Design a protein around this ligand. Sequence first.
Ligand SMILES: O=C(O)/C=C/c1ccc(O)c(O)c1
Ligand SMILES: O=C(O)/C=C/c1ccc(O)c(O)c1
Lengths: 193, 193
Amino acid sequence: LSTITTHHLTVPPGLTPEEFQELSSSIAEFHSYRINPGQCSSLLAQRIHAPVETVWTVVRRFDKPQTYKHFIKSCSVGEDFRMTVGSTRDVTVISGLPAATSTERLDILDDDRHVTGFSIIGGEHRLRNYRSVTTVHGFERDGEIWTVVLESYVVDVPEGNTEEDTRLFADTVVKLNLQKLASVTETLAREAG
Amino acid sequence: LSTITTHHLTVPPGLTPEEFQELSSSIAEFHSYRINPGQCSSLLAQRIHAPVETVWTVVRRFDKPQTYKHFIKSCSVGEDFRMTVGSTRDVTVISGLPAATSTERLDILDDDRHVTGFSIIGGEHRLRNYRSVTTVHGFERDGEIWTVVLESYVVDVPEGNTEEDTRLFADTVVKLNLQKLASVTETLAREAG
Ligand SMILES: O=C(O)/C=C/c1ccc(O)c(O)c1
Ligand SMILES: O=C(O)/C=C/c1ccc(O)c(O)c1
């Protein structure tokens, strides 16, 4: 039947053991899921040479995912949008197929603890019933400062797909978007303002 | 009926007018196509802070596209592969769909002029009858050296797609792969060896 993910028990790629030891409690709290047959789940990590709040200022902008994600043709939130849990956005993904819309709901937004997350609630693409959580974490050593971003998801494996089929695709997309996040926020950090 | 592409008559994004003026003859020679209704074509450019031959050493490796492209699960050329025009490779693309194979043929390989190109000759994906050409070009100013990579393609627009549907997708993939090429070759340059 259902099982618990083990992301919080091993070092994900792109994290050092030292970083993992500081983050294991956060991974248990925010990046653990109860999964069912036909679902898969992964945890990805990205080190960023910028302060936490600089990274968080970009991560938290639910209305502007194109600021750090690839393959976004457009994203609309409509008038009267407030940055509050329950809000939705309509994302049009660059897919090489006829353009549709992924409708996504903001599930979590904690500016104190630097946690956000969302669910895909409709849209006809390769990530059915996708739900993800992103957390942002600060590190220091001898006055030097960096950030780690953790992003996990659960998603349905489509009929005819292997788990590897779906997991490798979703991991690749998340990893590439985190690399964009790292580039964008490192530029913001180096330029101050 | 058929028309000629105009890539050689305007500055593509990511190129300066000065760079374009030095490259317009190469764009006419290597990045111009006769296209038909139902096809689209684009030219993309990427500046790289590395010497031409450093970039070319990576660009030319037809057997190892994963060295600079994203979304490659595997690539096989089989025993007795020689780097010669007419050779093929089997590329398995990370697609979130059940894994298949894009069979691709090496169309051009000129180590003197730094031109290569390939065609997708089978594979059941979003880039039917895709053909592309990549050229690598050196620039100098006051002893400083850089490279521009130009990559163009022609591809079929699937039934039900708009030209923008296909062109935005193919452009995004090419642009992201060129960014990876820039990162990989800039690292090779900075480390020498
Ligand atoms: O390629 C697909 O099949 C879907 C990709 C996708 C779907 C929803 C998003 O928010 C997003 O950034 C990417
Ligand atoms: O996403 C698709 O539909 C196909 C992508 C694709 C197809 C062939 C390649 O060589 C490649 O790098 C990517």
